[PDB]
Amino acid sequence: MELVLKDAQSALTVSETTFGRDFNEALVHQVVVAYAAGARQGTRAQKTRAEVTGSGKKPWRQKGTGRARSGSIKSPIWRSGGVTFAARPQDHSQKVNKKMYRGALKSILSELVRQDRLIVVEKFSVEAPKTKLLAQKLKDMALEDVLIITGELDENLFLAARNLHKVDVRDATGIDPVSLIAFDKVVMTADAVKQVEEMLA
Amino acid sequence: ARVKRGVIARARHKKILKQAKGYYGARSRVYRVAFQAVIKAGQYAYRDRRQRKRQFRQLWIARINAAARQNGISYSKFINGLKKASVEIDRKILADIAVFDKVAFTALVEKAKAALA
Amino acid sequence: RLNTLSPAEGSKKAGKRLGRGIGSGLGKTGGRGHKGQKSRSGGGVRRGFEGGQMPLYRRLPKFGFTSRKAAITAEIRLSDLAKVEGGVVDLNTLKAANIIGIQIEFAKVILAGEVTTPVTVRGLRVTKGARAAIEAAGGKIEE
Amino acid sequence: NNRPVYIPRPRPPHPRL
Amino acid sequence: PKIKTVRGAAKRFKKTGKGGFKHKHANLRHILTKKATKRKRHLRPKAMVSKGDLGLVIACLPYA
RNA sequence: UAGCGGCGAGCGAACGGGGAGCAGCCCAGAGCCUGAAUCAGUGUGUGUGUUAGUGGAAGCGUCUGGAAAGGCGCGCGAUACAGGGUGACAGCCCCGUACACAAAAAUGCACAUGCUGUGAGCUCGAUGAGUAGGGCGGGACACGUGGUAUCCUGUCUGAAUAUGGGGGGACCAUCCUCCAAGGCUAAAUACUCCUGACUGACCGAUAGUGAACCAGUACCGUGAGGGAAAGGCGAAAAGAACCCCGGCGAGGGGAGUGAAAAAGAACCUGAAACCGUGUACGUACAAGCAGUGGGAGCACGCUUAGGCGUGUGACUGCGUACCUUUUGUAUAAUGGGUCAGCGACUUAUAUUCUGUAGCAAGGUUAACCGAAUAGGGGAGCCGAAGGGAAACCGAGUCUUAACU
């Protein structure tokens, strides 16, 4: 399909399958959920009745005592020692098929174009590594929360946006569904656009 | 993600104790006993929603029977006369009329007697 | 929009939680009934147990034997016969197509249909209809 | 608060057989 | 760990095309003189596992 | 999976393939040539790192307030809005942070240059004997003595030596492959008593280590050993001068400090059981799961002047707690003195079914590589073809000499 520009007014040709396909609600949600789960690290643990410091001696005899039968000071129904099902460090990452990941990414890109949240422009660069310059460049464009995607990563643009929370700078290869969804506006360079079709295929 | 149940548990206990207000002794103070008292009050309320209808029905019949006999006719005869005369006044109105309007009841018994004869 | 995505209806069920109140349905033993071996924690009978009666897999007699030659043989379809490499098919170069496996050293061709390109097979065996199918296509058989 | 220690036999040795 | 097949079961049941199982009849080992030829002949061919005990067979050999 | 197995419960390979990492040598000996490479130990020099550190940008006015970092208005820094503190929430008040620098002295690592010690290269020869193997008894290999190969060993025996010997799963012949009875060798691998930084859909004082409070302490035991409870004033002690009751008390009432003293150290919030004082109503002729339905009177308030609400409740109909276990419980069958807190279907890997999503006669990768939730990687697994014990055949196959 045809992607219009706002600065050079130059036509761009892009496959409609990767930019004009329908929006799959179910597929995108699964990929987004999978991405969040993969961000976890699951560094937690408790002590079961075997790992609690203590001794296995019976608190009192089985019979004769007037109170409930007890077996150990570390039973889960006892104060200061227990946890019936203690947690262990676990991996929460889940598998997502390559095609499913690509399909969700294609679905997300198409809808950004439909909601005009995606803006394609020519090369986006800053002459000097100054956050002030980048802020001015984004101010006249009426953009405050933007994700800058460029074909080639340059330290000059990387340093300029480092201290800008609402602004992110990324490469085409390092593109994730969550970032595209989260950011209000996405700006893609002409080079950045081309690499997307090649990797998306 | 440990979850503490102090806030929720206290809310549930307060709700039961509020419903148990006015009961005697631990039934209004202790939750273990208050819960049983509240549940039993619920059973009785459901049961008595049906006994009330029959209890008032008995009261109306007794009032009509006293009023009809005072006019010189038994309750069973009086009701039969009304059915024969095609009168659809129910017991609640009949008892109400007997208590307040004696003349209206006298007309009814007179109408019932005529239908029977 | 990250707070607007939802899953498809019926994708989630929320699972079953046992022993959580009366109105939840399966509370008070959570659907495992009253006393018994099956109701105990960790209880149950192993696979094939019949309560003491001779199990079915013990009442019946073992039969047959395992043939080692069967693990080194495979069957070749007609559909995948023509997508190996050009128009020549042999015991070798099928592993390159990855349709038999490295360890396989015997192969047969069976009638699976959908064969168009004429192909030549050497060192393989074509049962009865594979010979007819390729000959119609324009192939040949030689050992 | 704390369990006793002596724990004597409270039951009386008198079987009713 | 992965499930362990019941080796004894795997030596007595073979899976078929439609998910059934074939087994050898269980009365043709010894004490054969007193048996009629008709009964021995009918026990020779393999037979299908009954429905009632099919569920038991599935558990024993979940892989095969 | 093949196998092992009272062929029960169970145990469970190898060949082969894909990856991480790769490095080969020496003695059993003489000669020629003899620092000839590579190594280990002691000096010098370069680089880097550790052990102290230095600089480090940019805000003010009004409103609320005990106090603003908050609201409102207008500014500036950012290769620094990572964090912590500051009288409520700070990019611009402070410590820090990105960034750029720093070592007299001691040190690990990678190089170049000296010394010490064994030691290059070529020819010829040699090439591990009470050993291999065997009998008996055991053990280890998935392999429980079984038809049982292979390895190790207590006991008794015992070769050939390269025209020789070992193995190829009883064993024999033919072939293929290797050379035991002498040794050395970093890499990928396992763990954290300890040190630094960083992270967490981990805990937040009955939790988290037994121990957030000088806790393995108090305390218990002859001893090995067992083993607690206990966190929170306020921004700042500004921790209550002084007066009065009292026993030069305790405790209290004033005064003062503070935004707040029902924040006064018995100190944030301050629930429940439990214990009290006051007010309204009821109760000393009335029998029982103590409620429920009806209901007079009384005391408070509301509009209207009749009721509506709140509390109490004479009198009256009906009514023998809950849980558990049972054919069946008010049962005199079990359990609970009460309150608060904690306390029981979880987790990992496989397999089957259902729903849903992707792709579709195809589907999908694992380890691993990867400036890395991407992309590579198709080793492999499942499916499209079954029948037979198997060879084998194949939309057929098996059964049988062969099928109506």
Short mmCIF file of C-alpha atoms (C1' of nucleotides) in Angstrom, two decimals, chain C residues 8 10-11 18 20 28 32 35 46 57-58 62 64-65 67 69 75 77 98 102 108 110-111 125 127-129, chain F residues 2-3 7-9 15-16 324-326 345-346 355-357 378-380 384-385 389-395:
data_model
loop_
_atom_site.label_atom_id
_atom_site.label_comp_id
_atom_site.label_asym_id
_atom_site.label_seq_id
_atom_site.Cartn_x
_atom_site.Cartn_y
_atom_site.Cartn_z
CA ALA C 8 -10.63 -14.33 22.54
CA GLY C 10 -13.25 -19.08 25.71
CA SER C 11 -9.45 -18.88 25.75
CA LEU C 18 -10.83 -26.84 45.85
CA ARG C 20 -13.07 -22.65 49.15
CA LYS C 28 -15.38 -29.88 51.51
CA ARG C 32 -13.02 -36.40 45.77
CA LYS C 35 -13.36 -41.62 52.98
CA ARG C 46 -0.90 -47.70 40.16
CA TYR C 57 -1.47 -57.14 30.84
CA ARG C 58 -0.64 -60.23 32.93
CA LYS C 62 3.42 -62.07 25.33
CA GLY C 64 6.25 -61.86 18.77
CA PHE C 65 9.69 -60.32 18.71
CA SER C 67 13.16 -56.98 14.30
CA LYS C 69 15.93 -54.59 10.27
CA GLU C 75 8.73 -45.93 2.96
CA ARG C 77 5.74 -41.54 -0.98
CA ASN C 98 15.53 -35.09 4.91
CA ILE C 102 20.72 -40.59 8.37
CA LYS C 108 10.56 -48.43 -0.66
CA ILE C 110 4.55 -46.73 -2.43
CA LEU C 111 1.57 -45.30 -4.28
CA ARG C 125 12.08 -50.55 -4.60
CA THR C 127 6.01 -51.85 -4.99
CA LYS C 128 3.38 -52.25 -7.72
CA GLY C 129 1.71 -48.91 -8.37
"C1'" A F 2 16.65 -51.85 22.17
"C1'" G F 3 17.14 -54.69 26.32
"C1'" C F 7 9.64 -60.60 32.63
"C1'" G F 8 6.34 -58.34 38.82
"C1'" A F 9 7.18 -53.45 40.98
"C1'" C F 15 25.27 -46.80 17.67
"C1'" G F 16 24.36 -42.33 15.26
"C1'" U F 324 -18.43 -34.06 61.61
"C1'" U F 325 -19.60 -39.17 60.90
"C1'" U F 326 -23.77 -42.03 59.67
"C1'" C F 345 -5.45 -29.41 46.02
"C1'" U F 346 0.61 -26.35 44.99
"C1'" G F 355 -11.57 -24.48 24.24
"C1'" U F 356 -8.88 -20.80 21.70
"C1'" A F 357 -4.82 -18.61 18.25
"C1'" G F 378 15.38 -28.30 11.04
"C1'" A F 379 19.69 -32.30 14.89
"C1'" G F 380 15.12 -34.09 15.85
"C1'" A F 384 0.05 -37.74 5.63
"C1'" A F 385 -0.27 -46.03 4.92
"C1'" A F 389 5.49 -62.52 15.14
"C1'" A F 390 8.95 -61.50 11.37
"C1'" A F 391 11.26 -61.65 6.48
"C1'" C F 392 8.26 -59.29 3.36
"C1'" C F 393 4.26 -57.05 0.74
"C1'" G F 394 1.69 -52.50 0.01
"C1'" A F 395 -4.26 -49.54 -0.74
#
